[PDB]
Amino acid sequence: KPAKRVAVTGAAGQIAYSLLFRIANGDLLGKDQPVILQLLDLPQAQAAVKGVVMELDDCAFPLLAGVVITDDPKVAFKDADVALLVGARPRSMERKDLLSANAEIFTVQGAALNEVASRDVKVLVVGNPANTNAYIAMKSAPDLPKKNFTAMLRLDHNRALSQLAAKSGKPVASIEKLAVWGNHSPTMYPDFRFATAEGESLLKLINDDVWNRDTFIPTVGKRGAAIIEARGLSSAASAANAAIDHVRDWVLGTNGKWVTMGIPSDGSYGIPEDIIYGVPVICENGEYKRVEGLEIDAFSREKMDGTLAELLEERDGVAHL
């Protein structure tokens, strides 16, 4: 096949460093799709990006047809077929500015995407706060299907499969129908009321339901910090892997298996429209199709509404644009 173009921001950072090499290896679009990597980061981080590119070249990857490097979003995004917006401001400063400084960045870049990117582009926002950055980008590109901006919930989703695999003693790969609702945050609702496992209901097998409110939910949400405390650095490799899973799956197909994906609300489940909210989906033909009419019980929906308010608190905070 001819090459596809992948834009990746925050090219000099840790998530990028785990990401770029599996991308060049064919992990993202497949073992037979060449790719061309187009890389943004700050003016002062250009030298470091070159350093990363010298390392990519030194891997001799068959599929890497070319690399572009630049501090200009408009160049970074030209003819981009996928864009991974990994770069973002970290808080260093109250929830007030984290939210504000990132709006700048994500209006600018969505502006640029809508101006130059392939009309057919798949956007995935990784930079925290993922959902709202996404929303700001989507909003900033009236010309591209709103359905093309997603935020990464797949790391929360994957973290929860490991908690479940462990608990049930069952093989992580043999878990179907798991769901994660809401914000990429401590607030997301990891939902297994439907999960199976190589035959059996996960409620059945585990039952407990206290391990659930008490251990499970909050372990999955405090996982990022648990990783920092142990190694003193954030989880770039698991985050890059989930970004790969999210995009691979989106493009290539999910096979009726459910995956969780932050995508613009249509209106279901109690979520306002045009809101980037994690909900389960099935992927096929380069498209995601939501999983519908799931019974939403009492507990489940107080959690769904709690995360869905953090979001509105987030939205209405940047809304002045």
- Cα 82 to Cα 113, 169, 247, distances in angstroms: 10, 37, 9
Under rule CB under 5 A, residue 62 binds Mg ion: no
Under rule CB under 8 A, residue 295 binds a second copy: no
Element (H or E) spanning 261, and its range?
A: strand 259-264
At position 210, the amino acid (one-letter code) is: V
Tokens of 301: 């929906």
- Count of residues engaged in binding Na ion, rule: CB under 5 A: 3
Tokens of 308: 């869905």
Under rule CB under 8 A, residue 198 binds a second copy: no
Residue placing its CB nearer to Na ion in the complex, 45 or 83: 45
CB of 180 to Mg ion, least distance (A): 11
Among the listed residues 257, 286, 289, 306, the single contact to Mg ion using CB under 5 A:
257
Number of H helices, E strands in the chain: 12, 11
State the Cα–Cα distance between residues 239 and 267, nearest whole angstrom: 28
Using DSSP, state whether 61 is helix, strand or coil.
coil
Residue 320 is among the residues annotated as catalytic for this protein: no
- Cα 101 to Cα 50, 71, 104, 175, 318, distances in angstroms: 26, 18, 6, 39, 10
Stretch that binds Na ion, among 5-13, 67-75, 135-143, 291-299 (CB under 5 A): 5-13
Cα–Cα–Cα angle for 236, 132, 71, rounded to 5 degrees: 60
Contacts with a second copy, residue ranges (CB under 8 A)? 12, 17-18, 21-22, 25, 27, 47-48, 50-52, 54-62, 155, 158-159, 161-162, 165-166, 171-173, 223, 226-227, 229-232, 235, 237-238, 241-242
Binding positions: 10-16, 91, 95, 102, 109, 126-128, 159
Contacts with Mg ion, residue ranges (CB under 5 A)? 257
Binding positions for substrate: 91, 95, 128, 159
Contacts with Na ion, residue ranges (CB under 5 A)? 12-13, 45
Catalytically annotated residues? 184
